[PDB]
Design a protein around this ligand. Structure first.
Ligand SMILES: *[C@@H]1O[C@H](CO)[C@@H](O[C@@H]2O[C@H](CO)[C@@H](O[C@@H]3O[C@H](CO[C@H]4O[C@H](CO[C@H]5O[C@H](CO)[C@@H](O)[C@H](O)[C@@H]5O[C@H]5O[C@H](CO)[C@@H](O)[C@H](O)[C@@H]5O)[C@@H](O)[C@H](O[C@H]5O[C@H](CO)[C@@H](O)[C@H](O)[C@@H]5O)[C@@H]4O)[C@@H](O)[C@H](O[C@H]4O[C@H](CO)[C@@H](O)[C@H](O)[C@@H]4O[C@H]4O[C@H](CO)[C@@H](O)[C@H](O)[C@@H]4O[C@H]4O[C@H](CO)[C@@H](O)[C@H](O)[C@@H]4O)[C@@H]3O)[C@H](O)[C@H]2NC(C)=O)[C@H](O)[C@H]1NC(C)=O
Ligand SMILES: *[C@@H]1O[C@H](CO)[C@@H](O[C@@H]2O[C@H](CO)[C@@H](O[C@@H]3O[C@H](CO[C@H]4O[C@H](CO[C@H]5O[C@H](CO)[C@@H](O)[C@H](O)[C@@H]5O)[C@@H](O)[C@H](O)[C@@H]4O)[C@@H](O)[C@H](O[C@H]4O[C@H](CO)[C@@H](O)[C@H](O)[C@@H]4O[C@H]4O[C@H](CO)[C@@H](O)[C@H](O)[C@@H]4O[C@H]4O[C@H](CO)[C@@H](O)[C@H](O)[C@@H]4O)[C@@H]3O)[C@H](O)[C@H]2NC(C)=O)[C@H](O)[C@H]1NC(C)=O
Ligand SMILES: *[C@@H]1O[C@H](CO)[C@@H](O[C@@H]2O[C@H](CO)[C@@H](O[C@@H]3O[C@H](CO[C@H]4O[C@H](CO)[C@@H](O)[C@H](O)[C@@H]4O)[C@@H](O)[C@H](O[C@H]4O[C@H](CO)[C@@H](O)[C@H](O)[C@@H]4O[C@H]4O[C@H](CO)[C@@H](O)[C@H](O)[C@@H]4O[C@H]4O[C@H](CO)[C@@H](O)[C@H](O)[C@@H]4O)[C@@H]3O)[C@H](O)[C@H]2NC(C)=O)[C@H](O)[C@H]1NC(C)=O
Ligand SMILES: *[C@@H]1O[C@H](CO)[C@@H](O[C@@H]2O[C@H](CO)[C@@H](O[C@@H]3O[C@H](CO[C@H]4O[C@H](CO)[C@@H](O)[C@H](O[C@H]5O[C@H](CO)[C@@H](O)[C@H](O)[C@@H]5O[C@H]5O[C@H](CO)[C@@H](O)[C@H](O)[C@@H]5O)[C@@H]4O)[C@@H](O)[C@H](O[C@H]4O[C@H](CO)[C@@H](O)[C@H](O)[C@@H]4O)[C@@H]3O)[C@H](O)[C@H]2NC(C)=O)[C@H](O)[C@H]1NC(C)=O
Ligand SMILES: *[C@@H]1O[C@H](CO)[C@@H](O[C@@H]2O[C@H](CO)[C@@H](O[C@@H]3O[C@H](CO[C@H]4O[C@H](CO)[C@@H](O)[C@H](O[C@H]5O[C@H](CO)[C@@H](O)[C@H](O)[C@@H]5O)[C@@H]4O)[C@@H](O)[C@H](O[C@H]4O[C@H](CO)[C@@H](O)[C@H](O)[C@@H]4O)[C@@H]3O)[C@H](O)[C@H]2NC(C)=O)[C@H](O)[C@H]1NC(C)=O
Ligand SMILES: *[C@@H]1O[C@H](CO)[C@@H](O[C@@H]2O[C@H](CO)[C@@H](O[C@@H]3O[C@H](CO[C@H]4O[C@H](CO)[C@@H](O)[C@H](O[C@H]5O[C@H](CO)[C@@H](O)[C@H](O)[C@@H]5O[C@H]5O[C@H](CO)[C@@H](O)[C@H](O)[C@@H]5O)[C@@H]4O)[C@@H](O)[C@H](O)[C@@H]3O)[C@H](O)[C@H]2NC(C)=O)[C@H](O)[C@H]1NC(C)=O
Ligand SMILES: *[C@@H]1O[C@H](CO)[C@@H](O[C@@H]2O[C@H](CO)[C@@H](O[C@@H]3O[C@H](CO)[C@@H](O)[C@H](O)[C@@H]3O)[C@H](O)[C@H]2NC(C)=O)[C@H](O)[C@H]1NC(C)=O
Ligand SMILES: *[C@@H]1O[C@H](CO)[C@@H](O[C@@H]2O[C@H](CO)[C@@H](O)[C@H](O)[C@H]2NC(C)=O)[C@H](O)[C@H]1NC(C)=O
Ligand SMILES: *[C@@H]1O[C@H](CO)[C@@H](O[C@@H]2O[C@H](CO)[C@@H](O)[C@H](O)[C@H]2NC(C)=O)[C@H](O)[C@H]1NC(C)=O
Ligand code: NAG
Lengths: 231, 314, 211, 39
């Protein structure tokens, strides 16, 4: 019953300060504790540190130079800023929700424990890499049906070619349809830009003209684009 | 000189050490470095990365006890010969000295087990009575006190580390018993007492001494406040390594005008001891491997007053 | 450092090893990882497990020293495909800041899924942009091991030859695309064009032509 | 153990040695064991 989503504006220049916040709509956050983790393709997951309602902080050995994270009480959520990012810090990051248990090898006073920190429910995640690139919006072209296999079924999709990161909405008719959906993640090019395609399977009796509209967004470019496809 | 610093642990609780170090092999010019695990008290520093020296190296030699021999105490019956005879007294309320009205003839002691213990006695004889106990002369502080019970209460001293060991050969026939890797948790030496029985056996030790300082007078208690490391704390043997616990929880009460709640008492373990207050060749106690656990039967204690202050006030 | 591999047969259950083996009493967390999406969680103590997870997996409880964390993955399916991380917390080691090494699994014993191709020419207004390019699509094919080739009739292309490597949906089978930088000039200059894959040891792969 | 070459004394492995004084000799002589008065 506790939920997630993380907000990255995009990619900030080298030798600079990150900004990411991940809001939660579940309950009271001054009662528990939500950390960070990092996926990076071609390398393993890694966890980096945390802090408390009673403000007791911690960093990760390789990374403690300039990670600092302080969180707000009015807005129940966390706010992480770094300084001086390299190309390597390119990654999707999940705000990670840590539930603590005790353990103990015996009886408290003696000394008697490390505490483990295990992590319940986290977020879909928001994507941020890093390179010195600006912002531009995609290209929007329609690729009509074939007139595919025997009726019923046929095919049709939208093309989006030249856009800054792959992570872009592409809804159809504001999500009115989800049957037969398959949006392909894109292919990187020598020019340096993802190029995606996304297609739904239709029947030839379904034809034709019942207002299929392809709806794509992209925030760093702040572009809102729909495009009407037709044979 | 055999360099080491602290043992692997999250920095919590001179727990122990782990030195790596020169040694002579069976062959003479041949040498070798190997490692072992000592305790804070066996070694003392001088100068680098860092490294200390063995506490006794200062003043005395050492011969390690053969682990083939064991120091579990057994009953000993001392015997007077023909041409003589021992004799026993046999009234329960007898105090330290005086003629005994009830007397019966023995020639050899009952089974006395020579327990090596400082400040307390246990697994000893127990009088059918209420624990009445004597000095050389109570009026003076300097001469000790020697309690012993009427119903014993249990004592189980513990350290739950499974030590490992390794025979290594110093030379022709000489094999030194190095302590090896610890496998499992890190755990300190301690000892349990349920106060429920302690404070009530205490309770009867409370009232009887009264018959010598008036039935209306203060009494007192806290921890030992004088002497060396070995006797200020409970020196004894359990299974092959010797203990030294501050008896802090115990000496904790004032009783004037007449759920398990088990005491737990931290101890440190020794290996090289100049016993019986005798300087000279020390003994190195070989370790003990695996768990340890020793039950026990408190029978008595030894005490000494502190002397000069206001009479009968406090 | 990186991935290390374990393979099991479909239907049947097997082991899992772990690095980093503990020194004292244990409390190891798991994390089920899926490339791109959230790493779920299967246990938090070697004994119990969060809610909503099938009651199958279970690490080995710290009963005595001698145990070494191990799991056994009954009712195997393609859904169990992932990489997971053996995060350690023992008695005397300090704060454990790295996870366990990434660990491979692929399920073996699910025979193959043939791909299915689509092919739909440049836009009716890409032509005007002075650029033109069409891309193959394929669907639902296991394994994700396929090479594609593009075909000027009686001559391959070897130009604008970049494609995804097979990545995979929520159907548990993989998908892929292959893009084709071209110009509207040679687009009409030619009768037709192809882009036909080589999954398995099989073909099925047709073509397209200008209006 | 290992060069040109060189070995080590078979016992060095496990025990010490005290050489017999050549002043003493191990030529055996007759010994008459004796039971005492009372036996
Ligand atoms: C001398 O006098 C001394 C003074 O009295 C005396 O000291 C005692 O020493 C012994 C050892 O020498 C100590 O024994 C250990 O005790 C550990 C702790 O046990 C206590 O704490 C747990 C934890 O309680 C939290 O969690 C439970 C579980 O959900 C909750 O229900 C609780 O509400 C509680 O949660 C709240 O509190 C937390 C704070 O603790 C908060 O963080 C939290 O947010 C919540 O607010 C309790 O569960 C224990 O209760 C059980 O045990 C007692 C007896 O100890 C029973 O009376 C009781 O009915 C319950 O059965 C207890 O309160 C133990 O964890 C430890 O045992 C584990 O470790 C050893 C070695 O590491 C393993 O070999 C062993 O197998 C145990 O591992 C099990 O548990 C772990 C962790 O859960 C699992 O990962 C693992 O799989 C394994 O599971 C198995 O057992 C599970 C149950 O244990 C079971 O669920 C599984 O299915 C599986 O079967 C060890 O025994 C003892 O603590 C000292 N006493 C005191 C008071 O501290 C000494 O004995 C005397 N004698 C001497 C020295 O000779
Ligand atoms: C007190 O002070 C002392 C100082 O004197 C301390 O002593 C030192 O302690 C450290 C502990 O960190 C030791 O380091 C360890 O040395 C190991 C020696 O490597 C051996 O193996 C090499 C190759 O393997 C051969 O032998 C194995 C059997 O061992 C055999 O199976 C195999 O087929 C092959 O024949 C060989 O080349 C060497 O010569 C040795 O024979 C070394 O392996 C250890 O590496 C560990 O730890 C590092 C730490 O980062 C890891 O990164 C490594 O990956 C490796 O990980 C181990 O655990 C993994 C699981 O988590 C396994 O996957 C690894 O393979 C490896 O496990 C092996 O061994 C296990 C049994 O122990 C098996 O279960 C596995 O299957 C593997 O076989 C490590 O570096 C010092 O050597 C030691 N020095 C001395 C002089 O003693 C002492 O610790 C101190 N004590 C205290 C309490 O503080
Ligand atoms: C200092 O330390 C000492 C020593 O630790 C402490 O003193 C000890 O305290 C113990 C109490 O906690 C006590 O032993 C226990 O006895 C219990 C029985 O008492 C209860 O039941 C009886 C009736 O049966 C009542 O009369 C009584 O009032 C109580 O209600 C046991 O339940 C205890 O644990 C079981 O496990 C232990 C192992 O630790 C076994 O040894 C024990 O016997 C118990 O049961 C198993 O074993 C018996 C046979 O031994 C079986 O019949 C039974 O079914 C169980 O099955 C196992 O074994 C069988 C094989 O027989 C096998 O088929 C099966 O599969 C199982 O494997 C516990 O044993 C000690 O006597 C006592 N010691 C002394 C010297 O007094 C002291 O308090 C400490 N002091 C301080 C201050 O801390
Ligand atoms: C056997 O086992 C028993 C069981 O414990 C031991 O008993 C202990 O013995 C030691 C002897 O070494 C006793 O230590 C002496 O304690 C006094 C008091 O400490 C004061 O001074 C220090 C500065 O040195 C302060 O920092 C202390 O601060 C406490 O109080 C203030 C508030 O007043 C607080 O801010 C602190 O955080 C701390 O409070 C916390 O704990 C207290 C309870 O302890 C609690 O009330 C509070 O809310 C907090 O939780 C304190 O004011 C100390 O002055 C002596 O000084 C000697 O050492 C210092 C260096 O540390 C030198 O400056 C000085 O000149 C002396 O050389 C002693 O350290 C200890 O009290 C005692 N404990 C008990 C429970 O009896 C035995 O010693 C053990 N025996 C062996 C042989 O191992
Ligand atoms: C116990 O107390 C004693 C008291 O001193 C401690 O003393 C140590 O003694 C030894 C030997 O006397 C010292 O050895 C030194 O080694 C260094 C560097 O050695 C490295 O490089 C060598 C080549 O330069 C190489 O030969 C070495 O080993 C090779 O060969 C062996 C097999 O034979 C193989 O195992 C190795 O892997 C190598 O293949 C090694 O790689 C050396 O520089 C020292 O300097 C001496 O010699 C140089 C000339 O070379 C000279 O200029 C110097 O003035 C000096 O005379 C020396 O050879 C050791 O360093 C001493 N300890 C310390 C801390 O320095 C002893 O260690 C204690 N514990 C024990 C013995 O367990
Ligand atoms: C305090 O700490 C000590 C540690 O010193 C503990 O002592 C240990 O207790 C455990 C009990 O849990 C003992 O295990 C038992 O061993 C006996 C006898 O072992 C035989 O049978 C077992 C199978 O049951 C088998 O594993 C043994 O075989 C060895 O050699 C085989 C090759 O021939 C190999 O296949 C096998 O796996 C094992 O070797 C392995 O280990 C070595 C390194 O250790 C490795 O190099 C090798 O390649 C192998 O991996 C043997 O045939 C069994 O009957 C029992 O079932 C149980 O397994 C330990 O033996 C024991 N260790 C010592 C040193 O004593 C204390 O229990 C502990 N106590 C407390 C209270 O905490
Ligand atoms: C790990 O080993 C180090 C030693 O290398 C331990 O550090 C030691 O810490 C104590 C204090 O905790 C220092 O004691 C000091 O003694 C002087 C008098 O000698 C006193 O005036 C100080 O107030 C203090 O008590 C000791 O010097 C220091 N050792 C050093 C610096 O070499 C450390 O404590 C060990 N770890 C644990 C958990 O104990
Ligand atoms: C420990 O004390 C008891 C008496 O408190 C000694 O005698 C034991 O008494 C209990 C009942 O009180 C009996 O169940 C035991 O069988 C008795 N044991 C023996 C050996 O007689 C006991 O001897 C003491 N333990 C010692 C001396 O090791
Ligand atoms: C009696 O002695 C015990 C120690 O054996 C003292 O216990 C301390 O009590 C406080 C609670 O106020 C605990 O937080 C400490 O942990 C205890 N200390 C230890 C070492 O356990 C107790 O204060 C003493 N009482 C008197 C009046 O002397
Ligand atoms: C009564 O108490 C006083 C001090 O309180 C003491 O001096 C006196 O000896 C006591 N009398 C007896 C009979 O114990």
């Amino acid at each position: 019953q506790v939920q997630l989503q993380e907000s990255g504006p995009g990619l900030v220049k080298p030798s600079e300060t990150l900004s990411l916040t991940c809001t939660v709509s579940g309950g009271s956050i001054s009662n528990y504790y939500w950390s960070w983790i990092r996926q990076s393709p071609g390398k393993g997951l890694e966890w980096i540190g945390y802090i408390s309602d009673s403000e007791s902080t911690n960093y990760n050995p390789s990374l403690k130079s300039r990670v600092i994270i302080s969180v707000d009480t009015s807005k129940n959520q966390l706010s992480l800023k770094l300084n001086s990012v390299t190309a390597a810090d390119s990654a999707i990051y999940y705000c990670a929700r840590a539930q603590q248990g005790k353990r103990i090898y015996g009886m408290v006073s003696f000394g008697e424990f490390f505490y483990y920190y295990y992590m319940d429910v986290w977020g879909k995640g928001t994507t941020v890499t890093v390179s010195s690139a600006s912002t531009k919006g995609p290209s929007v072209f329609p690729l009509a049906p074939s007139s595919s296999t025997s009726g019923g079924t046929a095919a049709l999709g939208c093309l989006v070619k030249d856009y800054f990161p792959e992570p872009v909405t592409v809804s159809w008719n504001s999500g009115a349809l989800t049957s037969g959906v398959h949006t392909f993640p894109a292919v990187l090019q020598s020019s340096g830009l993802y190029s995606l395609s996304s297609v739904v399977t239709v029947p030839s009796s379904s034809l034709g003209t019942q207002t299929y509209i392809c709806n794509v967004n992209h925030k760093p470019s702040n572009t809102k684009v729909d495009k009407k496809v037709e044979p | 000189t055999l360099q080491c610093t602290n043992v692997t642990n999250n920095i919590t609780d001179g727990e122990l050490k782990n030195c790596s170090f020169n040694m002579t092999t069976e062959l003479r010019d041949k040498k070798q470095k190997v490692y072992s695990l000592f305790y804070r008290l066996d070694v003392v520093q001088i100068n680098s990365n860092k490294e200390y020296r063995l506490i006794n190296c200062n003043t005395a030699a050492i011969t390690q006890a053969c682990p083939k021999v064991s120091f579990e105490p057994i009953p000993i019956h001392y015997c007077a010969p023909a041409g003589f005879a021992i004799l026993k007294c046999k009234d329960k309320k007898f105090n330290g000295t005086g003629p005994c009205p009830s007397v019966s003839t023995v020639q050899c002691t009952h089974g006395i087990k020579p327990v090596v213990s400082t400040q307390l006695l246990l697994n000893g004889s127990l009088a059918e009575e209420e624990v009445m106990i004597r000095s050389e002369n109570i009026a003076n502080n300097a001469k000790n006190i020697l309690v012993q019970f009427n119903t014993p209460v249990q004592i189980n001293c513990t350290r739950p580390n499974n030590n490992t060991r390794k025979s290594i050969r110093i030379g022709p026939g000489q094999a030194f018993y190095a302590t090896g890797d610890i496998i499992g948790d890190i755990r300190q030496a301690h000892c349990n007492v349920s106060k429920a029985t302690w404070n009530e056996t205490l309770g009867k030790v409370v009232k009887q001494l009264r018959k010598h300082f008036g039935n209306n007078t203060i009494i007192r208690f806290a921890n030992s406040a004088g002497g060396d490391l070995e006797v200020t704390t409970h020196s004894f043997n359990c299974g092959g390594e010797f203990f030294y616990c501050n008896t802090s929880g115990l000496f904790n009460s004032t009783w004037i005008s007449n759920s398990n709640d088990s005491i737990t008492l931290p101890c440190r373990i020794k290996q090289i001891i100049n016993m019986w207050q005798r300087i000279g060749q020390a003994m190195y106690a070989p370790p003990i491997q695996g768990v340890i656990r020793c039950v026990s039967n408190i029978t008595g204690l030894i005490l000494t007053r502190d002397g000069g202050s206001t009479n009968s006030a406090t | 450092s990186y991935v290390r591999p374990l393979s099991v047969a479909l239907g049947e259950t097997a082991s899992i090893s772990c690095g980093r083996q503990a020194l004292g009493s244990r409390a190891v967390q798991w994390y089920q990882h899926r490339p791109g999406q959230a790493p779920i969680l299967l246990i938090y103590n070697n004994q119990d497990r969060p809610s909503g997870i099938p009651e199958r997996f279970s690490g080995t409880p710290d009963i005595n020293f001698g145990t070494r964390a191990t799991l056994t993955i009954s009712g195997v399916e393609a859904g169990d495909e992932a990489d997971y991380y053996c995060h350690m917390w023992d008695s005397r080691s300090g704060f454990s800041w790295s996870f366990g090494g990434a660990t491979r699994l692929t399920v073996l014993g699910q025979p193959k899924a043939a791909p299915s191709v689509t092919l739909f020419p440049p836009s009716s207004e890409e032509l005007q942009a002075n650029k033109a390019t069409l891309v193959c699509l394929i669907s639902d094919f296991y394994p994700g091991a396929v090479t594609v080739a593009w075909k000027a009739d009686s001559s391959p292309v070897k130009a604008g030859v970049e494609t995804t490597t097979p990545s995979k949906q929520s159907n548990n089978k993989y998908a892929a695309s292959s893009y084709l930088s071209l110009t509207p000039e040679q687009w009409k200059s030619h009768k037709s064009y192809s882009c036909q894959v080589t999954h398995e040891g099989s073909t099925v792969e047709k073509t397209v032509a200008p209006t």
